[PDB]
Amino acid sequence: TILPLNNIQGDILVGMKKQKERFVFFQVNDATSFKTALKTYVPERITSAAILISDPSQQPLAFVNLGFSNTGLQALGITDDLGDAQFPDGQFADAANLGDDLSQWVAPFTGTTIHGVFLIGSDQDDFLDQFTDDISSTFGSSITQVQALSGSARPGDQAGHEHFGFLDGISQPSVTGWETTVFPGQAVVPPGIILTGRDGDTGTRPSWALDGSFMAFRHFQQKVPEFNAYTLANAIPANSAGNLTQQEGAEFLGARMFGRWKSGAPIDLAPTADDPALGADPQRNNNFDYSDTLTDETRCPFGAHVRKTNPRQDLGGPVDTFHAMRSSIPYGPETSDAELASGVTAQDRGLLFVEYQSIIGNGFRFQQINWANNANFPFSKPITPGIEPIIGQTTPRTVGGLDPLNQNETFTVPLFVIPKGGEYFFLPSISALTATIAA
Numbered sequence: 001t002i003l004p005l006n007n008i009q010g011d012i013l014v015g016m017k018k019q020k021e022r023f024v025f026f027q028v029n030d031a032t033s034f035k036t037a038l039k040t041y042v043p044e045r046i047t048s049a050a051i052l053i054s055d056p057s058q059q060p061l062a063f064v065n066l067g068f069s070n071t072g073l074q075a076l077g078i079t080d081d082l083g084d085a086q087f088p089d090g091q092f093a094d095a096a097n098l099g100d101d102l103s104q105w106v107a108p109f110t111g112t113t114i115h116g117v118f119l120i121g122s123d124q125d126d127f128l129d130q131f132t133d134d135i136s137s138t139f140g141s142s143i144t145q146v147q148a149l150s151g152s153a154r155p156g157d158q159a160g161h162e163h164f165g166f167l168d169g170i171s172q173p174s175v176t177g178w179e180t181t182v183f184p185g186q187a188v189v190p191p192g193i194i195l196t197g198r199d200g201d202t203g204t205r206p207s208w209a210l211d212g213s214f215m216a217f218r219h220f221q222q223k224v225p226e227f228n229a230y231t232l233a234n235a236i237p238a239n240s241a242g243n244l245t246q247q248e249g250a251e252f253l254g255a256r257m258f259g260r261w262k263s264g265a266p267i268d269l270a271p272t273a274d275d276p277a278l279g280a281d282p283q284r285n286n287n288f289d290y291s292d293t294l295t296d297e298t299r300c301p302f303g304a305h306v307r308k309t310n311p312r313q314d315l316g317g318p319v320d321t322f323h324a325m326r327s328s329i330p331y332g333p334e335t336s337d338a339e340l341a342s343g344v345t346a347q348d349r350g351l352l353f354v355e356y357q358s359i360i361g362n363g364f365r366f367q368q369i370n371w372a373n374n375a376n377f378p379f380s381k382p383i384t385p386g387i388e389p390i391i392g393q394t395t396p397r398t399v400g401g402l403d404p405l406n407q408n409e410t411f412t413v414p415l416f417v418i419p420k421g422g423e424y425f426f427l428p429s430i431s432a433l434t435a436t437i438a439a
């Protein structure tokens, strides 16, 4: 079905994969002025998939994508019904459903004043400042940047790992419609699961929404010291392979909670010990489907993060409907001595989470509500799965199966991932930005 890679905002389909990234949130002050600026800004800065997959030699110093909130489209006079059920009322209005603690959200997210967001991906912060200025210059006061969240890859060997220390970005759906390599174990879905209007999208979209996509953005603050402290105070005693020490048991616990070792080695393949080499191998680190641990939790818990967000075999076989693309990035400094040596967070660090799907309710929202937060999911298992330890928000946050030996044992885990704000955005096709929004 050959997708128009030159017209699709790159981050939706390929992911910026740049070291630094900045999210510039803004509200529209003067619509007319804004659309006019848009007409000159897009062709000059909005980077497409085609540009991201082309050789470095011709890529910008920084990538820029742009998304709008419902109130943003409203402010710009674009009143078409995009067809998604959550997008219209905003995420904060949906936060309770996600199981969020509203007291934790902070402005300017605690409402719908945010009209859209500019995603700037570059390798150096100074380039980030350069393009940031270019934005508030091309647009001047026709808009007002209300907040900017910036993130960067963690140092050295940690690059690519989120702040709890786990390698992130391993498993991603592969969509048909473009020449691309498929890793063994990688889901292959119709372009409609991610791009609105395309094949597989069950929603009813206006024609201009073609090749667009909804972004679920979550500003997460992570309590790292607390996380470690907790795994030590709960280190798993042993497993098939033998008795585990303190560290060993703690490391094993963390891995049991995620479904992967901090190295990326999926526990359904390295069930009793880490396999660094396997983790670093994209041709092997994702070739599993729990088909060998369906009715028992020896190889992998029923409620491990990755298994809850992508149950794979736990639901019969392949299913397109619930896959989504992720393009998140860590933020904040590393954990100090005074921090870990106290088990109490003393600095702001976390994840700037970005998830793309044609239907919010079938991706992020589904993974969150229907799976992660559902104690009875995966369905019909010998032992109750429980609440996903990492992002599940149903209380009591009780998850079972962590200890492979005495599986029935349950653990009520403290929430280490804290929602500070979020929003639902729509990223139109590059052409739509000018033919419809700026029109």
Ligand code: HEM
Pocket: 162, 163, 164, 166, 167, 168, 169, 170, 171, 172, 218, 220, 222, 258, 260, 305, 306, 307, 309, 310, 324, 326, 350, 351, 353, 363, 364, 365, 367, 368, 372, 390, 391, 417
């Ligand atoms: C502080 C926040 C979070 C951290 C540390 C974290 C992320 C992790 C890690 C470290 C992996 C392993 C890599 C892989 O299989 O790429 C992964 C997987 C995944 N996570 Fe998260 N995550 C967070 C939040 C969320 C939220 C809020 C959702 C959805 C409601 C989610 C969804 C997914 C998906 C869909 C996958 C891949 C499953 C698969 O295909 O095997 N994550 N995540």
